[PDB]
Amino acid sequence: TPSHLSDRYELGEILGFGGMSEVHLARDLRLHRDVAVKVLRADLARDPSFYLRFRREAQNAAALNHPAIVAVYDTGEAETPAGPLPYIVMEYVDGVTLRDIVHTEGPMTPKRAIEVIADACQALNFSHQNGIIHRDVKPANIMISATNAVKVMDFGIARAIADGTAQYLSPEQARGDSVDARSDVYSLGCVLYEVLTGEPPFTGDSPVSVAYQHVREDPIPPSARHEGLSADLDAVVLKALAKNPENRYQTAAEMRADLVRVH
Numbered sequence: 001t002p003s004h005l006s007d008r009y010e011l012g013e014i015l016g017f018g019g020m021s022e023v024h025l026a027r028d029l030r031l032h033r034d035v036a037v038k039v040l041r042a043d044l045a046r047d048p049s050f051y052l053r054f055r056r057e058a059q060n061a062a063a064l065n066h067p068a069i070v071a072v073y074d075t076g077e078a079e080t081p082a083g084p085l086p087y088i089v090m091e092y093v094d095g096v097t098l099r100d101i102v103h104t105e106g107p108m109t110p111k112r113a114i115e116v117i118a119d120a121c122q123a124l125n126f127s128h129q130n131g132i133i134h135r136d137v138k139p140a141n142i143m144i145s146a147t148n149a150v151k152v153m154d155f156g157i158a159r160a161i162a163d164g165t166a167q168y169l170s171p172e173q174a175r176g177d178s179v180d181a182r183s184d185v186y187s188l189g190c191v192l193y194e195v196l197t198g199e200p201p202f203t204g205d206s207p208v209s210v211a212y213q214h215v216r217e218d219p220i221p222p223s224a225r226h227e228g229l230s231a232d233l234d235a236v237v238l239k240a241l242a243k244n245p246e247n248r249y250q251t252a253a254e255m256r257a258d259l260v261r262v263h
Ligand SMILES: O=C1c2c(O)ccc(O)c2C(=O)c2c(NCCNCCO)ccc(NCCNCCO)c21
Pocket: 015, 016, 017, 018, 019, 023, 036, 070, 090, 091, 092, 093, 094, 095, 096, 097, 100, 140, 141, 153, 154
């Protein structure tokens, strides 16, 4: 890919990938600031379905603004020698992902863990509040800023009400049905489990055996996986992870409430 988009954004190294598109650290030359930028593969960008999805991503993202959700500052399409390339300019987050943090620290203190998710809930509730389901909650999509903020990201597959991996899927995603706020709650639960125990709820030889685990197995109570985890907190995690949406928290707000009640 080229080094300068539109004359304005000078792409640097690769921060991560949001499904098949590269996310870059770049510098906005008009505003003297570091910003992160997502660039549709290029091949990808000739397919409508993706062009659309991608345009829609930006608009979905941009159309919500909250300090615990990454901001969008801009989208365009650069006309390069390698053709047209739509992109999205987003608030940069100098930090690490929950993934990374769990992988290097091990689990985090319960105290820490509670607030961190607590925050995630507001973010996600705000999104729901605004008619956006994220559909893709997992450690690799939540960040801790250098200033210790929480930033939820990758509205890559988030759906308005306009109308890969294994272990952070909701059962209804698994069976392949309509998903909603609850599905996000569940995904979030998984993430909570992950952070508290150093371990995800379920693991397998491939996506499919984990998918079944989501649908079939009870989760090991966290306390069992790792001492110094409160009985009160156990039942919290496990509610988010209720197999039936009905038995889950009905919104992020409800979940958060309970979390704040145990911290
Ligand atoms: O920093 C971002 C980032 C950003 O600052 C602004 C917008 C973004 O979309 C990202 C970003 O996506 C990102 C990373 N990608 C996560 C890909 N999702 C996991 C697959 O579903 C993965 C990592 C990542 N930054 C942390 C890099 N530190 C770890 C070693 O470099 C970011």
